[PDB]
C-alpha cells in the first residue's frame, strides 16, 4: 500500500532500473572471461545473489522512493497499520533484549567480585567460570530488573554517593 508518497518496490520501475544497472555491470565483467572458467562462476554467483536479493525486497512490502531504493517507516503506529513493523519496531525489541542482557551480565559480575579481597584483580583477570555462569543465568534479566526496581535495590541512596562541592 502506497503511503507517504512512496511506491511499493514490487511495482516500482526505478527499482527495476537499479537491478538492471547492477546486473549489466556484472555482464560487462563476464565478457572478459571464458564461459567455463572459475572467475565466470564467481560472477554468476554474484549475479544470482543480486537477483535473489531484489526479489526478496520485492516480496516484503518494502516501500521505494523516487530514487528507487527502499525506505523504512519508524513511527510505530504507521509501521503496525501498514505492515512495516519488521523494519524498525521488531529490531527495537530485539536490540533492547540483548542490550539488557549484556548490561545485566556485566552488572552482575561486578557486584559479585566487589565482595572479594582484592576486587580489582578480578577485573583484569576475568573469573571465567563465574563469568560463564553469569552469562547463561542472565537470559531472564527482566526478572532481576523489575525486582530491583520495585524493591528499591536498583539505586544507591544519595547519602552514599560521592559528589562535588555544590
Amino acid at each position: 500500500e502506497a503511503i507517504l508518497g512512496l511506491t511499493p518496490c514490487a511495482e516500482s520501475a526505478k527499482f527495476q532500473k537499479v537491478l538492471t544497472k547492477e546486473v549489466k555491470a556484472l555482464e560487462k565483467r563476464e565478457k572478459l572471461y571464458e564461459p567455463g572458467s572459475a572467475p565466470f562462476q564467481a560472477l554468476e554467483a554474484t549475479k544470482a545473489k543480486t537477483q535473489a536479493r531484489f526479489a526478496k525486497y520485492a516480496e516484503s512490502g518494502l516501500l521505494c522512493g523516487a530514487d528507487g531504493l527502499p525506505h523504512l517507516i519508524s513511527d510505530p503506529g504507521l509501521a503496525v497499520k501498514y505492515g512495516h513493523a519488521g523494519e524498525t519496531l521488531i529490531p527495537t525489541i530485539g536490540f533492547l533484549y540483548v542490550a539488557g542482557y549484556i548490561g545485566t551480565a556485566g552488572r552482575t559480575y561486578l557486584q559479585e567480585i566487589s565482595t572479594r579481597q582484592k576486587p580489582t584483580q578480578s577485573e583484569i583477570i576475568i573469573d571465567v567460570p563465574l563469568a560463564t555462569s553469569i552469562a547463561f543465568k542472565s537470559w531472564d534479566w527482566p526478572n532481576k530488573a523489575v525486582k530491583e526496581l520495585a524493591s528499591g535495590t536498583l539505586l544507591e541512596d544519595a547519602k552514599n554517593v560521592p559528589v562535588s562541592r555544590r
Binding site: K159, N160, V161, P162
Partner: protein, 62 residues
C-alpha cells in the same frame, strides 16, 4: 566521642575526595591541640594517589 580504632566512619568534609564514602579508623590522637586527630584509611585512592587522611570529629559520621 572518638571512634574506636578499627571502626567505620563516613566523611562529611565537602572538599574531600572521600565525601559520602566510608573509611576505617586507624588512629585517634587524644591531645586537644591537634586540629585533625582521626586517621582514616580508604580503599579508593584519590587523584593524588594517597589512601589515608586526617579528619576532625565534626567531619565524620560514626
Amino acid at each position: 566521642a572518638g571512634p574506636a580504632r578499627g571502626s567505620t566512619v563516613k566523611v562529611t568534609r565537602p572538599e574531600s575526595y572521600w565525601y559520602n564514602q566510608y573509611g576505617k579508623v586507624i588512629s585517634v590522637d587524644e591531645s586537644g591541640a591537634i586540629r585533625y586527630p582521626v586517621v582514616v584509611r580508604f580503599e579508593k585512592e584519590n587523584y593524588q594517589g594517597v589512601t589515608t587522611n586526617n579528619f576532625a570529629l565534626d567531619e565524620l559520621e560514626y
